[PDB]
A paper describes a structure:
Bluetongue virus (BTV) is transmitted by blood-feeding midges (Culicoides sp.), causes haemorrhagic diseases in livestock and is responsible for considerable global economic losses.It is an unenveloped icosahedral virus, belonging to the Orbivirus genus of the family Sedoreoviridae, with a multilayer capsid enclosing a segmented double-stranded RNA (dsRNA) genome. The inner two capsid layers (composed of VP3 and VP7) comprise a core particle which remains intact following infection, whilst the outer layer contains two proteins, VP2 and VP5. VP2 is the attachment protein and protrudes from the virion surface, whilst VP5 is implicated in membrane penetration. Protein VP5 forms part of the outer layer of BTV, with two symmetric trimers of VP5 fitting like pegs into pits on the underlying core.
Here we characterise VP5 at two pHs by crystallography to provide a detailed analysis of the pH dependent structural changes and consider the consequences at the virion level. The structure was solved for the high pH form by seleno-methionine labelling, assisted by the contemporaneous release of the structure determined by cryo-EM and refined to 2.8 Å resolution. Crystals structures of BTV VP5 trimers at high pH and low pH show that at high pH the structure is essentially indistinguishable from that at physiological pH (Figs1 2).
Author numbering:
A (entry chain A): 47 to 52, 70 to 514
B (entry chain B): 47 to 55, 70 to 441, 456 to 514
C (entry chain C): 47 to 54, 70 to 441, 456 to 514
Write the structure that this text describes.
């Protein structure tokens, strides 16, 4: 229940190609980053499919094409009508199969990087060579970007388009090798074949959290850690271990869906046999699957809340972890009082959540303390104190959602640095207040490095 | 004219679904309002590719090859010389196709509505079937809304539920034309119109904006009835309230397209023949932009929620000017000064643009309306308002009017609306104008 | 270097909403980012229609090279022995881009030349072509006429509002394909985008080319239409817009020629130099390592770069507009709306790889913000907060001329600063990008 009271600094992210930030207090901008991401991923997928369909089928199996065809090409009726359970199983299996292939590739490269030099095979030597050539490009890019900064800057380290970022940053491209416009990542392949899209379409279960970042913050940090000097093989692993963390987190989610939730969906279909007009054993009726609806504010994302009074200095993050690790934390801000709150919380009791030992406080208990502790600060004006006291007896106003790309543990670690690292706290709050709020979001999602 | 006090200083829900549902915006943000339209167009174009690929044979079997002809002209073929398309024949084809799609939608809702308000014994086997299938979807929506309601904090103002477009179609769409109970395959009349670029081509050839001719993705009165019956099964009669709201909008759309065909189409034909000797290389097969500027509505007189700001630096003052479809040439004023807890309402006169049907000459000018508004507002500080832009609405004009009416008269509404950051309060007013809020 | 005091009828942004290029609040990093994201998605959807409708005619006119660049970008992926020579590709895409814009340029030149030629001197086809251009201008005039009497007594906003397809039909002087058929008009900007020419150059080299574009409407064309109310715009007056277009086309042509003669040879050199610095090096591949030599810092790209004050102020914003690399020029344009203050200053040339060398005059961007922030901070040394980028569509000279009117035209200064401050900032952006006309 941390109530910590708050040179060049860089957001560990790339603009253009990289994932977007938003002002936490702007519901519109947060909604639009998701809308734009979906439209951009759909246009990318057409290129992946056209370029690589034969090779995707050869590697991952025709199941991926089957899920794609069902999603957007064919609609079967009567006797030929698709078994939607068989479809749901197919899409879950395909998603898990794509991410496990990604994981194995990063594991192999990570293992090779921490395997002396003499001990490395010819192909281990080859593969580290190819990875280091890309890292050299990223290093030179970051070098040129760094001396372009003003004496006192708070901004993202670099700026490259998605195609340039894939060519330089993506460690283990599945197809597309060293041809720009042709690089096919596991995230691109999943999106192209609409694997998550179909799982969500059939079950109502949101899976936006099951993704990977386009660049690893710890990779960027290591490049800055070694200025001109070549980043150690060991230092590179930090980024690669962050990636495997997220991949394993994704794999555990899909396995939790297959072993825990899939059996109950099957059960629900047979139970509703006499509750549904023209019931079919081949169809998942929306009625049968509302059993597994998480409340919109309990999905695995950064949920943003505003103060119940007119304030642009107060915002609450409530970040929820994947369902299999049924965890969440509170991160509150009052920039007018230079105040930051952190707290670990209890587990939700929604259908999708895995059961844990019942420790931690309620989100409700957490916002009462946030407003309470704020009203006690010596820095607070008599007007502000009275507004915080009114808000405390009041409840926070839900704005919306902002999906995160790192592991839940890494977002937790990012939040921890925002509450404890006092050096961080003084390079973050500079410039227009609305700009400060974006920077806090960026610090929560990726991290900032001070120089 | 109605002028009350939005008293500032329970739970209140916006009758809309996030994700799948139509978007709101801060009225004072011109950028966000512009981008909701841009994003909607891009999302509808991606959806249309799936509708076309999955259903083209069945669309042609049901609505006729005219829809495919409009699509092909819009985005697949470009004919030249002797084979060059008669653009009037095209304009007629697209208007006819649009009208044919919406009349099929209307007939389906009518049939379901009629069945729902028929004695159980009186209902046919298929009427019993169809109400069964509709109720199964409503049960899903009810359970969804039930789970969503106990997730709310003690004091919340937000949208009732959150589901993706594909989940919302499966649970909310009463009369899917194709796609039955297969997610990713449900084809609505709104999806079919968009997929075949019917409005797109009418606008492209005439310059006439038709953004207003749409249907909502969920009926607010349907959501209201579900909340009206907590766990308890919504009455068949109660369900009709949403279905009647839908038929209102469909009939409103049908009257617009009929107004375009009988009133405006003849004058466009006339204008082409009149400009015979005013146009270099004139063709009877081409609609020249010169000939069709006669029918240009001023950008601020289109059927939408038009947003204006105060001529001084204020984030508390904003004016809605909502214009009805051209056939019902009506509009109203809805002014806000949140600093003074003030709301203005007023019915206004009819515009004299080409597209407007003539009415009896009552009501004050928009100019007369802002003078009073700004007079009261400037007391806190003649003034002319700053136009920000447009925000298209999905319900009937009558339902938006009714929504505006509740913002001026329902004092219980006024006290749950202005809470949190002022920018958030402005979005909530927009949401209340577009969909409505229910208090609990 | 000019420092003036902004002072304070109808005033109009010389742009069309819907179909026309977007503005943004300079102090909103999100809205600036999203206008670019939306533009790319809209251009990709448009390109599918251009390709499907016109592929045979594009190949007949410009050659199969355009289709080859498109196919490489989004349709095929060759491997092993059959793998594409990425240098041959880069040359092909640069050649194709240059070939499309030079065809556009020649068409505007021909129409411009005809418009200045005395009526008797004009050929039958010169008479035809001016007739067709004037019919479109009449449509634009009537559109603008109807739009003008819809304005309130005191209005500051864009002159007109039409969708892209309606704007192409009425405004685009020299459509390459699509003639007088809405949904079918193919501009050089549409054709370039459809065949992913710049997309592939950027994808292979990392060099941003967002600046190489044309506006969807010429501000000087709109100005001339307002200059002649009901009265027919003179042939000579129309040329002002047509000369602005040729300015931008020639600016684009000089950039691509600068890329081909100056930068392309060094990229080829860099590939051979890194022969022993790259694991599994190929003479057919452009490795990202080899092309970082030519990376412009993100804040030095040819765009309107926006900076905020290092303190909490919504009245202070700095434009730093950078010209195309071949004309290695830039200027500073600072605003403090709380003090009614505007700063202008010409600056020095950047020393990034892509910049053509000039004579070493002008002050540093750092020197420029020091003074700006000094005067501004008096209301409250300081370093500005970078927000992001906003690409411009007119010639660099025309944006410079637009900035000049914001600092010197005192009549302009009093119709711009009216209404909510956030709205005022958008209007300044609009005035910088297109211009405003007062009536």
């Amino acid at each position: 229940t941390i109530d910590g009271i708050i040179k060049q600094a860089v957001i560990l992210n790339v603009v253009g190609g990289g994932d977007s930030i938003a002002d936490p207090l702007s519901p519109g901008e947060n909604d639009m980053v998701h809308r734009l991401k979906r439209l951009e991923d759909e246009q990318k997928g057409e290129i992946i499919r056209t370029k690589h369909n034969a090779q995707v089928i050869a590697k991952f199996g025709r199941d991926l094409e089957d899920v794609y065809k069902f999603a957007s090409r064919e609609h079967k009726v009567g006797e030929e009508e698709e078994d939607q359970i068989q479809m749901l199983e197919k899409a879950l299996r395909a998603y898990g199969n794509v991410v496990k292939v990604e994981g194995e590739s990063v594991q192999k490269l990570a293992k090779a990087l921490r395997a002396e030099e003499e001990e490395r095979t010819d192909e281990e030597t080859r593969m580290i060579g190819e990875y280091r050539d890309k890292i050299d490009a990223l290093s030179k890019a970051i070098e040129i970007e760094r001396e372009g900064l003003q004496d006192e800057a708070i901004q993202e380290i670099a700026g490259m388009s998605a195609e340039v970022l894939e060519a330089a940053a993506e460690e283990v491209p599945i197809f597309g090798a060293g041809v720009a416009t042709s690089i096919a990542t596991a995230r691109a392949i999943e999106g192209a074949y609409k694997l998550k899209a179909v799982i969500t379409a059939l079950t109502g279960i949101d899976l936006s959290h099951m993704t990977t970042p386009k660049i690893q913050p710890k990779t960027l940090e290591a490049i800055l850690d070694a200025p001109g000097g070549n980043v150690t093989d060991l230092m590179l692993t930090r980024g690669l271990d962050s990636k495997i963390d997220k991949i394993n987190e994704n794999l555990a989610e899909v396995e939790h869906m297959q072993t825990s939730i899939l059996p109950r969906i099957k059960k629900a279909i047979e139970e509703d046999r006499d509750e549904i007009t023209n019931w079919s054993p081949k169809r998942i009726h929306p009625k049968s699957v509302q059993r597994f609806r998480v409340p919109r504010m309990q999905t695995p994302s950064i949920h943003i809340y505003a103060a119940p009074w007119d304030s642009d200095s107060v915002f609450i993050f409530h970040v929820i972890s994947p369902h299999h690790l049924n965890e969440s934390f509170f991160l509150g801000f009052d920039l007018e009082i230079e105040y930051v709150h952190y707290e670990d919380l209890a587990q939700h009791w929604h259908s999708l959540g895995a059961a844990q030992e019942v420790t931690g406080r309620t989100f409700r208990e957490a916002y009462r303390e946030f407003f309470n502790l704020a009203s006690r600060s010596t820095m607070a004006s008599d007007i502000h104190k009275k507004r915080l006291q009114r808000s405390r007896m009041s409840h926070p106003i839900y704005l919306g959602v902002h999906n995160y790309e790192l592991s839940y543990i890494a977002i937790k670690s990012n939040a921890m640095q925002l509450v404890t690292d006092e050096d961080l706290q003084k390079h973050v709050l500079r410039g227009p207040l609305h700009f400060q709020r974006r920077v806090i979001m960026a610090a929560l999602k990726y991290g900032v490095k001070v120089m």
